Amino acid sequence: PNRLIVDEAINEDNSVVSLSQPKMDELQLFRGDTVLLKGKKRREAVCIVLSDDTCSDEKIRMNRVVRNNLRVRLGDVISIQPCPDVKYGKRIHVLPIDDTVEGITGNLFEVYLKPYFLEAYRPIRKGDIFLVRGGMRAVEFKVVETDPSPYCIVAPDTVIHCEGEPIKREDEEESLNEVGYDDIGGCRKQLAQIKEMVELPLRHPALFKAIGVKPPRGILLYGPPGTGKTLIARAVANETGAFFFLINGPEIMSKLAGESESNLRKAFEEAEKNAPAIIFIDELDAIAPKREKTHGEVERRIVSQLLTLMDGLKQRAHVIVMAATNRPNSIDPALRRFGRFDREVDIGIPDATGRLEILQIHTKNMKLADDVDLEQVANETHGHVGADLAALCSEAALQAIRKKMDLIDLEDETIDAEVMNSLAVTMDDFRWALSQSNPSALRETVVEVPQVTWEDIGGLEDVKRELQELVQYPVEHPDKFLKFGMTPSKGVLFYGPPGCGKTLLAKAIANECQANFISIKGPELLTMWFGESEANVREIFDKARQAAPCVLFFDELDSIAKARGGNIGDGGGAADRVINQILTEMDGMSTKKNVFIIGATNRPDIIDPAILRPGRLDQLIYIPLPDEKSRVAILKANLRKSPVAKDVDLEFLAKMTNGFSGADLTEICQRACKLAIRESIESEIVPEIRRDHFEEAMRFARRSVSDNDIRKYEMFAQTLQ
């Protein structure tokens, strides 16, 4: 009783933990009460209990600062007790730790400690270490003297001393700036999967000796460079306490035959001697490239040596080997066989939310101006990875320190802390950094939950409901499908005129379902066909399997048929190299992976009919041109980005644009906007888009689908009944 499992917290406050209500009732404490935490090696900490909707009953959520002072690690268990006799102090003495005060000088109390303690009412105990961020530094302090004991609340009316030399860090405590889990931004789902595999073998080895269950022995991380593969490996070892050893392909390859194998063996021997231990092998494809792809004897030998050492992990107790590669298929296939590196985690590229998190992490120490908008940056930084977002934060700080601080700074060892704390980075500083940086992963597909909602699609109310039944119902009501022997469809194909929102339909359902959206476009299907590299289709479906739950959207299914001449072309059939691989992968994909495949084409008469057979995209939805009320909704949605005059009659315009698609209604909106810009510019040689601008646009905009094509689309939909 009164024992809780230590886990991560969302509230980063140095004096707060979060409990689930059933434990607050068992301990007979209320929200805001002070408790004491009993850790390891006769160490304790004082904190305030709050609550949230994420903590489980058996867990206690705390940050790194509390775990460090308690000398506990994630996965351990501590005792908790109320202490209602807590009172405020009158005097405290807090001094910085030398390990974190570097490059700065001045009145550290006024810069850090006073903002930290003043009106903050924080519970502290003698000997506590806590971190205060600011001035582009992260400085931690120790409590060395208090009049009350052993703990008190620091009130705004207390006297805070800070006199004496900086204190050297003790061997019983770790630095709070050491790489941990709180330094990792995006790919939090991937980190959770790793923790599930790694925490128990290292934190609770007794479980795997006493219980007949096999541990993981290796994890392969893959994705573009700079995504956090090497950051995770270090953070895991530091959080769990395992001895960390670093291996990298180039360094091993820099050694002569016999030296490279000996050094690789020593790395494994050291991990066992210091077990529990984690070995990280970077550039796995460089140290162990596919043997069948190299004629060199030494390179084939080092692959055999690594495979032997990996198999030896059945004897080396409590040793886990992690590795990083750019592509999961660029390494010798033997490494990925059962055992060795049979478990893999897809790191990929951080999504818009993760990219913001990364920008926030690398600015925690930075002062940001009120005009700084890191969410807008995260949305614009397409193709960027964590290494690029960190570079953007540093480069933006370079402009802030050059523009303002360079006229304050000296050519000396340290800079005043007072002026650094007031150094705000502006929006123009991040914009400059964005123009100077170049995304390291712009060609690779970014897979994420889309931000398109149903409110972004004009009309199609019935199709929206149909997608919900196709994607959500099979898993929200599985007992009804079993009761009536219904086989859920594996996917749906959209057909009809262009410019009716087929792309948004697939994104909107992926968004509401909180599923990742994978977008395959014509150019990718054509590249595989033309280059005789249809094998890459397997990698596309493999992304869907790893990204699940997800929606796998194949756009422009006719892109190859049109590239083959479309209506005339050659004398052959609709089958080709790429569609054959796609159809094969579709048949090999089970609905149990929570992957739903959506197709779209504007020319269904020239696609391989096989894709419409049962087991494939056997659900067909016709998307006609928007009707009268839908066209109005489209015009209103498209104009949400511009000022529009009250005299603009969007219903009248929609009534005239009877043959226009949603894309053609956009052309009208864009033309009316450009006409408003033209007149506005001329007036200086206007504040809003007037009716005259839309009426003038009506004389330039045209429907993209001719009357002959509209009838063909309707007759095709009629033919399919």
């Binding site: 004096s15 707060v16 805001g32 009460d33 209602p84 903050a120």
Partner: peptide, 20 residues
């Protein structure tokens, strides 16, 4: 007690200021 709720009020203010 009251000194504990005073610490809680300050912790809640810091948390809500960051969330908003």
């Amino acid at each position: 007690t009251n000194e504990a709720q005073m610490a809680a009020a300050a912790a809640l203010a810091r948390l809500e200021q960051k969330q908003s």
